[PDB]
Design a protein around this ligand. Sequence first.
Ligand SMILES: N[C@@H](CC(=O)O)C(=O)O
Ligand SMILES: N[C@@H](CC(=O)O)C(=O)O
Lengths: 501, 503
Amino acid sequence: GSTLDKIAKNGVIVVGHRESSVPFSYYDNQQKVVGYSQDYSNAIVEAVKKKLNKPDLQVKLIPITAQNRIPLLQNGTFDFECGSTTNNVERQKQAAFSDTIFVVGTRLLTKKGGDIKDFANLKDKAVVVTSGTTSEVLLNKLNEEQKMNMRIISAKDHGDSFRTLESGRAVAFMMDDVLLAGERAKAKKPDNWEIVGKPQSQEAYGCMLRKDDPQFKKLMDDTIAQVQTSGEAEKWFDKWFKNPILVSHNVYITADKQKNGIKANFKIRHNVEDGSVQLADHYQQNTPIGDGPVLLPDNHYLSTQSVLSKDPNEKRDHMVLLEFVTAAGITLSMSKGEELFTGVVPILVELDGDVNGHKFSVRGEGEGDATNGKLTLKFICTTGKLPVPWPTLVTTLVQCFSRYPDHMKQHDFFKSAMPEGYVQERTISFKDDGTYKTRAEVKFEGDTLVNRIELKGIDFKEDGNILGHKLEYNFNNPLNMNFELSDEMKALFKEPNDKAL
Amino acid sequence: AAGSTLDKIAKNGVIVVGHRESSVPFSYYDNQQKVVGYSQDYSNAIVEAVKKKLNKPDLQVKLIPITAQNRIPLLQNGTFDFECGSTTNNVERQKQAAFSDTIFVVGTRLLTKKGGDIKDFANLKDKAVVVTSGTTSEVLLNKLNEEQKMNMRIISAKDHGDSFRTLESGRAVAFMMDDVLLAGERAKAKKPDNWEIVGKPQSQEAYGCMLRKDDPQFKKLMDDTIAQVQTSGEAEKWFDKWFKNPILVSHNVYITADKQKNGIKANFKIRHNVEDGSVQLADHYQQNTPIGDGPVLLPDNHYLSTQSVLSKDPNEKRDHMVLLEFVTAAGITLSMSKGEELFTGVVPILVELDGDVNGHKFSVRGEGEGDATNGKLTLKFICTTGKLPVPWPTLVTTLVQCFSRYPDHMKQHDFFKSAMPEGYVQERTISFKDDGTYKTRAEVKFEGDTLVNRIELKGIDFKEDGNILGHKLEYNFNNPLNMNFELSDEMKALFKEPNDKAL
Ligand SMILES: N[C@@H](CC(=O)O)C(=O)O
Ligand SMILES: N[C@@H](CC(=O)O)C(=O)O
């Protein structure tokens, strides 16, 4: 028998994932399960839908830990898992493993400038390790065999392990080197932590499934090997390990039929330099300027990502912005205004602002490419220096440039209101702080899409995160990994295999 | 050939409708910025009559805000087609505009503090008095100030809400306006019972729907519609809805699929009335996952429209809450699961909650029934440990969305019923503004024939003096307003013989 028969009959595949194996299988700040291994898991699921000819197969992701993964496999709580599980000979007595998706060495994470340079320095020290892992076994064996008198703290997952080290309750955290780097990227001061020591082991990550299911295993292996030899595995590596990891924002849109328009709600979480976040709650209403027909949407959402940067040639207070937005939420030309966006469209943005009496103006210029959902803009404070952080103005500074998929084009209010345009009004509520109230007209003036805004901010705290300029210069809560592509992974990509190291 | 305004509407494919911002309860923004009211019921009926007259069933509507100051110029230059709100039809304004059949009759009076000095207009000598800019009452109040040499300091406020808050904040001793609008602002006051309508009416005035002059075909459509609604009994039913019964604002529970977990997510805001007249925001974040591993319905984005009424059982001496709730799904325009079939009848419900808020432990048990065919819940909840250490309204959302009514065209989007009988796990974080948070985990599933909601609630970081632990929340839901405004003899006579006469 085979699990693929259980799955075809049930119509659902049940998939285990980890909670804190960064950046392989973990919860993003919206509780979505993401990561390098989750990308393989998504590919394997798509392969299952093809093999079984079941394009509407459902997926149920359920969380597992290093401690309970094998018991939950063995009693059928999930069908397979991909995360950070080491394939080794001992575990092959209980389970089967796919082709290898990553290779690691087990090392130490410690504060710079100590006496922890290698495993021998753990003598008489408090050392943290995650329950149920290969490192926990290795560390206890080392403690016993070399008589090192460590006080080993066994924590329930990798984030808990790391915060033991971060809080000073342990001097080092032993784990897979890549996962040490993942927990480091999430730390308050990532620059404070270094990975040290001779690897105690070399270990291969594989997907785990029940034994005696060669057909199910073969579908995994074929999928992994194809991702690896086609080069996509390396592209996924660059995404998770060499570029900023972003979390998209969801702009939730509902029709406002009585105003022939829409309303939206969404939350922005601005990174604060101390490592906290500053919530900005957005309430939005839009209504057409013209008196002719628009498209009135069913509920849906926009998935948004923005990247803020600096222009080296500009000494004025400024912001360079790239933005990528796609609509979603409905599963499977519509307006005259839609036709105005099939090419590249020039954009002009003008903002007048007053925040706690501090008056300023902003001018932005660039282009929009709605076919690809992309914006490129450069903004300048034309009145001197900006009295608020640039990130707090991003949402205020043209959702007509969203990419609507073809099956959703009847729901694109924003383009349908063009060329006469729409009024966009927001109240942005900054938690424990003040409020922005904005009113803008978004419309074509000649061949240019113009966003003309007036902003009023009141009730802000002079020492708060906004008027005190405590926000990081970024968007979408980026995480940046410090981890090089090793020779072992270069070799893996050219020769997929499923062998324990 | 349909006349100017109907020709314009057919050309545009949209009818543009002026509305007021604070004419309560005729045409005003509710607390979710929806324009609502008695006059908007007429506006909607006229829009539907226009769709029929033009044979344009897909006609769109565009409401735009107007003021007492700018309503006539904006009408004259075609910025809107008509407005129904609280505009007096008088002979002066008929030089500039046309008026429909009358929809209400008022007298201009004073609103003042109950235990104070003002009993009639003469008591206003040498005192500060507020009135709304651009209204018939402003004209009357200024004429009385000069003709009786009263030395009044007349404050001219932007709209009726601003006028009333001038009175409420003590910056004026009285507010002169149409009596029903005074009653409307009073209903929205911090302490409605502190305010009294006094004085001999300075005028009697008829409200009409405004439209452009010299457009008889459009006026006739409006008059025929108004007169039909008034003689059929429908207008009296609207009157009861706005003036005799509690006005509620529905909550919108915004739902999106969570395909990874084979479930859904939701976000919404609850606004609890505070006893001092302010509101206490409760931001809700929700995640649902099926308990079973079989197929569910994964929905497109949509929302649930919810209203609840909280009451007391006269027989019950324990700390308790009687709850009646109605929920309908919406947000998608035009049997699907086995579990849907479990809800075609009346289903008994059991609710068990184990709570801990700032270390204060309590248990709640609820029983009743759900009728998903009509989106209706009837339950009674008892605090089985004694006094409830939080206000009952803060627990309503935690204490079975499977009983929502999904319209026929939306039944493929009902995750809640599709997960049955195995059920689902429902998790929430509820964030009270400037206060603590509730974290909840519940299992909703069939146990026998009974639909059971079993909850654990953990609340932390609450202020012992705040609105929750301090028991400062009103015992209600959906921000009710109560006009308690009687149907007058003049209104009965109007509905009997509709007419368009200025008074
Ligand atoms: N790869 C290690 C650690 C982990 O599971 O995250 C193990 O298999 O135990
Ligand atoms: N009915 C009065 C007040 C109002 O417009 O709200 C008027 O027409 O001026």
